[PDB]
Write a protein that binds this ligand. Structure first.
Ligand code: HEC
Ligand code: HEC
Lengths: 104, 104
């Protein structure tokens, strides 16, 4: 596989939720440094779904090839994002902006 | 609600998958212009899930307040993102980059 091309894919498709650097922060998704040879659900400090915690496989080329084809088929129950807004005041402010912008 | 604050929320939490401008493109999510007073699942040209197509409610302040609190509770079956990589060669290139970056 080509590292240059895979870097570009990573930046375009993965970096919004994941870092890969050593010492890198958790974002929407876990930091992935040391993933290879690690079991699912093991980045220290990250709260996974029970599905991702329990899948029990070891990450490596072959299992990433299958997972990446369709994460939710490979780990049914996995959740990639929470798209909502829990705070009442943020919801009200966002709704007021949407009422303006989606009408003008 | 405060339009200024809601604009900032939109940019930080929604704009990665949605546009709101008239004439705006579909991205991961549908363009939202003309949402208010429209039924779910109606942006022209966008392929929704059957869940979002069938929910059958009208979008307005009160229904957005509930949806935004937790989209998947309000529309069980909804899907916000496909995080995978369907092409074999992209997967191989991405895996090769991850093998390098997550180890160095
Ligand atoms: C935000 C919308 C995400 C995008 C885009 C991608 N990933 Fe992700 N990933 C995300 C979360 C929230 C989680 C944990 C899910 C859960 O059910 O707990 C994950 C998980 C992974 C994993 C497994 C990690 C582990 O077991 O420790 C991998 C290997 C992974 N994600 C890789 C990955 C790649 C390479 C992406 C680009 C194609 C990508 N993800 C997108 C959030 C998000
Ligand atoms: C990408 C990860 C998304 C983020 C972040 C947000 N939304 Fe979204 N939204 C997304 C998709 C793919 C879809 C269609 C889902 C389906 O099951 O088909 C939606 C849907 C909506 C809707 C309903 C639109 C309609 O019925 O026509 C609304 C009102 C909506 N999204 C609003 C919205 C807001 C305000 C967000 C910021 C808080 C937001 N979404 C995040 C994808 C994504």
């Amino acid at each position: 596989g080509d590292v240059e091309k895979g870097k570009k894919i990573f930046v375009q498709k993965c970096a919004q939720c994941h870092t890969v650097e050593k010492g890198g922060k958790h974002k929407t998704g876990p930091n992935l440094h040391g993933l290879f040879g690690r079991k699912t659900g093991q980045a220290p400090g990250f709260t996974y779904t029970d599905a991702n915690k329990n899948k029990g496989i070891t990450w490596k080329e072959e299992t990433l090839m299958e997972y990446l084809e369709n994460p939710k088929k490979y780990i049914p129950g996995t959740k990639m994002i929470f798209a909502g807004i829990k705070k009442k005041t943020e919801r009200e402010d966002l709704i007021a902006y949407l009422k303006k912008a989606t009408n003008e």
